[PDB]
Design a binder for this molecule. Structure first.
Ligand SMILES: *Cc1cc2c(cc1C)nc1c(=O)[nH]c(=O)nc-1n2C[C@H](O)[C@H](O)[C@H](O)COP(=O)(O)OP(=O)(O)OC[C@H]1O[C@@H](n2cnc3c(N)ncnc32)[C@H](O)[C@@H]1O
Ligand SMILES: [Cl-]
Length: 381
């Protein structure tokens, strides 16, 4: 059967696209190597931060705000839990974090609601945080935490109810693009459509070559740990925030304990360079997995440094400039690419689903996606 649209990779981006297409009666096939949500890609480990005031760049702010509204819409549409409004705390040494400074500029440029705090004020407001007096902070009360696996699961169920088809456990191996149609090849059969969306996560770094693209995309092994914590300090129930922070040796992101699961932490600016088909997905096989996390906790969040309850191993896919790629294929207007989310895309996946649907159906989008151009110089070595 010939589809209107085929999505290859039904993960964060692809499943959101599938939902957007299905809701409009577009006949859509999604193909995934596994059965999303799953633990082999970039979307597991339960939780993801969404921030609006954006330390990676003030220009992501409208897409973040649109995505936030889309997440509230999803919360209303499903029985799965989507979002909890933890707020997000950003801190770092005063005058020595570009990330903090840009987050502050973004909030002023877009009139976001934030609180500015420094030093002992941070430690006083949130028992359990111990920063030096020379640190400053910006706290965003209305952003928070997404349950990422639930997001994908909900978009899947909703899309499928509207007639989208999802072909699981099926790896796309090659492509054949014509001026007026697209074709995918798999071990389970070949499929055709009018339009293609390519959203294969870390595997974009191996298979975009089949579409005659040569773009630096490096996959990285990124672990997270959940730690037994003082629940009187670090529980969501006592308003402990989500956080993304810069310290002299890099950026860390974390989450309050939800229902006693433990504070969750990840070291964002370091990971191992890997291949997605040979990555070691067992937490704790390198001593850095646990040690890098406790190095942060014992300094800054000392009551959240108990027994390791749970670990996970996830992948980032970085571009050279760490900005996304969201665009048409330069040689094929019937092919849409979503790649290179550089460890910070999940929060936008709802909005990206909308962009991808518009690009597929119309070749354009109402969103400003200029900074994510596939033709930009900074993508290339
Ligand atoms: C790993 C990670 C990422 C992350 C994060 C912490 C960790 C440890 N923290 C984040 C945060 O707090 N907030 C945020 O906004 N983002 C954060 N991230 C990044 C984010 O999770 C990623 O940027 C995002 O998930 C990327 O999504 P994308 O849709 O690109 O990737 P995916 O969900 O893995 O989906 C890809 C799918 O493609 C399928 N696949 C692969 N190969 C094939 C083939 N050949 N054929 C068909 N399907 C294929 C995969 O199976 C997967 O489902
Ligand atoms: Cl990523």
């Amino acid at each position: 059967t010939h589809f209107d649209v085929i999505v290859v990779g039904a993960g964060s981006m692809g499943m959101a696209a599938g939902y957007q297409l299905a809701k409009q009666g577009v006949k859509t096939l999604l193909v995934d190597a596994f059965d999303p949500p799953h633990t082999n890609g970039s979307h597991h480990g339960d939780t993801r931060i969404i921030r609006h005031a954006y330390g990676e760049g003030r220009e992501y702010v409208p897409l973040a705000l649109r995505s936030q509204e889309l997440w509230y819409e999803l919360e209303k549409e499903t029985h799965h839990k989507i979002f909890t409004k933890t707020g997000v705390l950003v801190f770092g040494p005063k005058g020595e974090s570009a990330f903090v400074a840009e987050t502050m500029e973004a909030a002023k440029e877009h009139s976001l609601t934030v609180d500015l705090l420094e030093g002992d004020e941070i430690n006083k407001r949130w028992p359990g945080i111990t920063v030096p007096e020379n640190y400053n902070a910006i706290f965003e009360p209305n952003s928070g935490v997404l349950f990422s696996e639930n997001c994908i699961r909900a978009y899947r169920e909703l899309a499928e109810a509207r007639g989208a088809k999802v072909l699981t456990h099926t790896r796309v191996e090659d492509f054949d693009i014509s001026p007026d149609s697209v074709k995918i090849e798999t071990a389970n059969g070949s499929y055709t459509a009018d339009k293609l969306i390519v959203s294969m996560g870390a595997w974009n770094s191996k298979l975009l070559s089949k579409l005659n693209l040569d773009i630096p995309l490096q996959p990285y092994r990124q672990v997270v740990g959940f730690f037994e914590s003082d629940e009187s300090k670090y529980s969501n129930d006592i308003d402990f925030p989500g956080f993304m922070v810069e310290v002299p040796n890099g950026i860390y992101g974390g989450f309050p304990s939800f229902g006693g699961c433990g504070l969750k932490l990840g070291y964002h600016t370091f990971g191992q360079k890997i291949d997605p088909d040979t990555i070691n997905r067992e937490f704790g096989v390198y001593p850095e997995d646990e040690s890098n996390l406790r190095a942060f906790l014992e300094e800054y969040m000392p009551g959240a440094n108990g027994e390791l309850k749970r670990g996970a191993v996830c992948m980032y896919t970085k571009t050279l400039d760490e900005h996304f790629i969201i665009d048409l294929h330069p040689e094929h207007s019937n092919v849409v690419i979503a790649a290179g989310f550089s460890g910070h895309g999940f929060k936008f996946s709802s909005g990206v689903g909308e962009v991808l649907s518009q690009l597929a159906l119309t070749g354009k989008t109402e969103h400003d996606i200029s900074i994510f151009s596939i033709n930009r110089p900074a993508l290339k070595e």
